[PDB]
Paper text:
Here, we present the biochemical and structural characterization of two CBASS systems, composed of CdnG and Cap5, from Asticcacaulis sp. and Lactococcus lactis. We show that CdnG from Asticcacaulis sp. synthesizes 3′,2′-cGAMP in vitro, and 3′,2′-cGAMP is the biological signaling molecule that activates Cap5 for DNA degradation. Each monomer of Cap5 is composed of the N-terminal HNH domain, the C-terminal SAVED domain, and a short flexible linker connecting these two domains. The structures revealed that both Cap5 form homodimers, resulting from the side-by-side packing of two HNH domains.
The overall structures of LlCap5 and AsCap5 are very different. The different locations of two SAVED domains are responsible for the difference, as the overall structures of the HNH homodimers are similar. In the structure of LlCap5 homodimer, two SAVED domains do not make any contact, and they are far away from each other. Therefore, the structure of LlCap5 can be described as in open configuration. Specifically, a well-coordinated Mg2+ ion is only observed with AsCap5-HNH, and nine residues of LlCap5-HNH near the active site are disordered. Therefore, it is reasonable to conclude that the configuration of LlCap5 shown in Fig. 3a is enzymatically inactive.
Author numbering:
A (entry chain B): 16 to 62, 71 to 283, 291 to 383
B (entry chain A): 16 to 62, 71 to 223, 226 to 283, 291 to 383
Write the structure that this text describes.
């Protein structure tokens, strides 16, 4: 008779007789009560910790409370425990259909003020709630420790190495995570490389940052809002060419006089601009058109393919999802370029085996 | 505010934050607590009679309590009610996979002492518990009000009608029952007629001699084979009547049968336990409807009558009367072995 364990047991049972499931917080003819403290009868099997102290007692209504202790013949503790477990496990099986634990991986090379990075990472658990997850306390940050080398030709190489090292330094907590929600925003080559480092570690949700709304990182639609298509800039394929230019024109339409002649394909979205991507479904459809209607088309049209030159103008989630889709030692080398200021499209980094 | 309603709310939620489902009766690092009185935070929208007093507040952990009121922008009360109803209704949907309500219909023309009839009907809700049901308070008894004319040539004629009236007198609560568990024991013609009166979630139970629960099943799986033996070379169209002999409890010898083509429906194991499970009864009814009645309807397109001579446990005639298809089947004349004289006509099933 300790009121704490009573409260816990009333909770595990949803306030019900563990045989007939009568609500013991409701009178048999009217409204409420002083409830399980009075109406309910706990049966103790045989004489603040809890290890199976909860797995000893069981709630009962009046009828079955008598019934089951005045016939220990038909109702052994053997059958009784079976009934207890088979009901409680059907109750707490609601986790299995509720929200799921999810860790958070954050990477922000664009926002520099530290008290603003914190200000903004304060919205991630809310987005997790809005996308059928909940924050399990583990947040992983990729260090922008090299903001000092931000314009040295070697920046990408070193930032890549840093990223790789950190990712591997948390690889075991990454593969063992229930779900990983990623909030990444950085130059498109580094986003691609982040997607490469991850590479479908079971359950990963890649989120997109918008300008508008209370939650910049939350989706703005839950359904497909764009068509993505391909336009090839070469009459038909051959077997001498080893390199192909692939131009992703989602955020803007990249004009060809910016591209350093080599066969080219252009992957467009119908609606171009800041909102080419509005839902996870948009990203899925983009990646489908990308792998099937673009990359595989390139591998077919060019069996002697040795390199793809990627020129992107895409929102943040798209390079990460492209870097996740890479098939190591089955795909070719992917050289990703980045528009440096004034200079045009300049090489940034590469994906290999 | 009052722990009066708090206990009910802790119950509807299974002791959990209605967003993240953290168990609020367990510490984040160790064992138990003083639990939801301390660890939990109820959010009230605005200020022991519960009609939606329960549908106002909601449980929260620390994190999400601090989170959801310091952000009424993303978290309006509309979204909160949506989450609350979804989770709460997702919780109490476990009855839908628990026990099922079941009413009780009792009929005992064999046991006569009144303090023994009640003594024995005190065991029915226990059988309901052991067969995935629970008693919903409604017990229906078919009255053996004619115990005094039990041997008058017309007894059956009257008893049937009595039963019929009683059935109609509760016909409306019978169609509306979640489940109806039947504990019937009487001469096989009356059991057949009871099954006919029912004709429909109905669980027909069998009484055994041995065990703590005479009426509970003794197996949950098939324990017998039922087969047919025909005593006529092939069918014709001149015959209008057929003798059907059900030899489950014993092997009815034919010199007791009042010549007419005959089929015999036997079980491998005959005796008091030819039927041991509901599955045995299902298999019997399958062999009966398909391998017997339809066989006769084929072999005899000018069929006009089936003569039933039974030796079956109590559940079998009731289930046969349940399986009767009115105005598709023919007349079923059911006989009962009366003392010395052999099988004497008892009653009939028609349209
Ligand atoms: Zn109960
Ligand atoms: Zn919570």
């Amino acid at each position: 008779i300790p009121e704490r364990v009573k409260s816990a047991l009333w909770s595990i049972t949803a306030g019900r007789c563990e045989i007939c499931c009568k609500k013991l917080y409701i009178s048999d003819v009217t409204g409420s009560l002083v409830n399980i403290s009075q109406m309910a009868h706990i049966k103790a099997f045989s004489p603040e910790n809890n290890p199976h102290q909860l797995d000893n007692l069981l709630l009962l209504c009046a009828e079955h409370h008598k019934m089951i202790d005045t016939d220990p013949d038909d109702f052994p503790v053997d059958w009784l425990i079976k009934q207890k477990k088979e009901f409680e496990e059907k109750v707490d099986a609601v986790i299995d259909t509720q929200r799921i634990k999810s860790s958070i991986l954050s990477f922000n090379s664009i926002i520099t003020k530290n008290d603003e990075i914190k200000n903004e990472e304060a919205e991630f658990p809310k987005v997790l709630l809005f996308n059928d997850n909940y924050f399990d306390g583990n947040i992983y940050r990729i260090n922008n420790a090299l903001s000092g080398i931000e314009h040295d030709p070697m920046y990408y190489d070193l930032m890549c190495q840093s990223m790789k090292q950190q990712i591997e330094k948390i690889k075991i907590p990454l593969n063992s995570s229930e779900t990983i929600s990623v909030f990444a925003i950085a130059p498109q080559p580094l986003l691609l490389y982040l997607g490469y480092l991850l590479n479908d570690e079971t359950n990963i949700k890649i989120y997109q940052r918008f300008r508008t709304g209370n939650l910049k990182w939350n989706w703005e639609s839950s359904e497909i809002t764009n068509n993505f298509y391909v336009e090839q800039l070469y009459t038909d394929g051959n077997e001498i060419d080893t390199e192909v230019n692939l131009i992703l024109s989602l955020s803007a339409e990249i004009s060809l006089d910016r591209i350093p002649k080599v066969p080219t394909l252009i992957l467009r979205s119908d609606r171009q601009g800041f909102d080419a991507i509005k839902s996870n479904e948009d990203v899925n459809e983009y990646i489908s058109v990308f792998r099937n209607l673009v990359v595989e088309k390139i591998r077919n049209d060019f069996p002697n393919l040795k390199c793809i030159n990627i020129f992107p103008a895409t929102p943040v989630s798209v390079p990460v999802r492209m870097g996740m889709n890479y098939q190591k030692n089955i795909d070719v080398e992917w050289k990703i370029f980045n528009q440096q200021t004034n200079v045009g499209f300049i090489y940034s980094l590469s994906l290999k085996g």
